[PDB]
Amino acid sequence: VSTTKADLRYVGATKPAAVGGRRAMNLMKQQPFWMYGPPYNAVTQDEYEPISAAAPKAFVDYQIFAPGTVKVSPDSVNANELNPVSGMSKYIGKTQKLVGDQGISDRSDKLPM
């Protein structure tokens, strides 16, 4: 009782990793939210990609621009919505990887390079 979206993902994981590229990690699946934290430490699929190791020496200065052309939005303006009495926060700290999404990603968009 499989689906077309599931079988188009898993067939990229049958090529070798010298050929398939980022598609070699396409067999991994979404786990519960507590599985990504401190006793268990399960790895997301974004950490196998080169976007997780991006740290350039260059930087945008932000005083080059005209006033009015830099925008900043928060995620909430509420203190117990940003951090509860427990430490389980989506926004502040090391507990923002404890979420029910984002274990898997889309690396079947581009190419096998």
Partner 1 sequence: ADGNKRLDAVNSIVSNASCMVSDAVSGMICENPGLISPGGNCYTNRRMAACLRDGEIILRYVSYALLAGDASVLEDRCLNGLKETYIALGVPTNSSIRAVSIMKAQAVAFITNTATERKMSFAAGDCTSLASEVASYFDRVGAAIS
Partner 2 sequence: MKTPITEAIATADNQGRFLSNTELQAVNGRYQRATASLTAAKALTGSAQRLITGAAQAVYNKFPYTTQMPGPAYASSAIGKAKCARDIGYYLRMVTYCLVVGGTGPMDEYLVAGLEEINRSFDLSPSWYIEALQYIKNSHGLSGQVANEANAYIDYAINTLS
Partner 3 sequence: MLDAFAKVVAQADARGEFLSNTQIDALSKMVKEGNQRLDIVNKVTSNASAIVTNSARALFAEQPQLIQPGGNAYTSRRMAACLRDMEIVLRYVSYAMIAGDSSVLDDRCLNGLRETYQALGTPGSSVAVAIQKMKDASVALANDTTGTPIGDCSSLVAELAGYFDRAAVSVV
Ligand X SMILES: *[C@@H](C)[C@H]1/C(=C/C2=NC(=C\c3[nH]c(C[C@H]4NC(=O)C(C=C)=C4C)c(C)c3CCC(=O)O)/C(CCC(=O)O)=C2C)NC(=O)[C@@H]1C
Tell me which residues touch partner 2 (CB under 8 A).
Answer: 16-22, 24-25, 43, 47-53, 113
101 touches, from partner 2, ligand X, partner 1, none (C-beta below 5 to 8 Å by class):
ligand X
* Closest distance to ligand X from the beta carbon of 27 (Å): 16
Residue 67 binds which entry of partner 1, ligand X, partner 2, none, with Cβ cut-offs from 5 to 8 Å by kind? Answer: none
Q: How far is the CB of 16 from ligand X (least distance, A)?
A: 20
Q: Which is nearer to partner 3, 82 or 104 (CB)?
A: 104
Judged on CB neighbours under 10 Å (0-12, 13-18, 19+), 97 is middle
109 contacts ligand X (rule: CB under 6 A): no
At closest approach, how far in Å is the CB of 65 from ligand X?
Answer: 6
Q: Which is nearer to partner 3, 32 or 84 (CB)?
A: 32
User: What is the rounded distance in angstroms from the CA atom of residue 97 to the CA atom of residue 110?
Assistant: 25
Q: Which two tokens stand for residue 84?
A: 């509860």
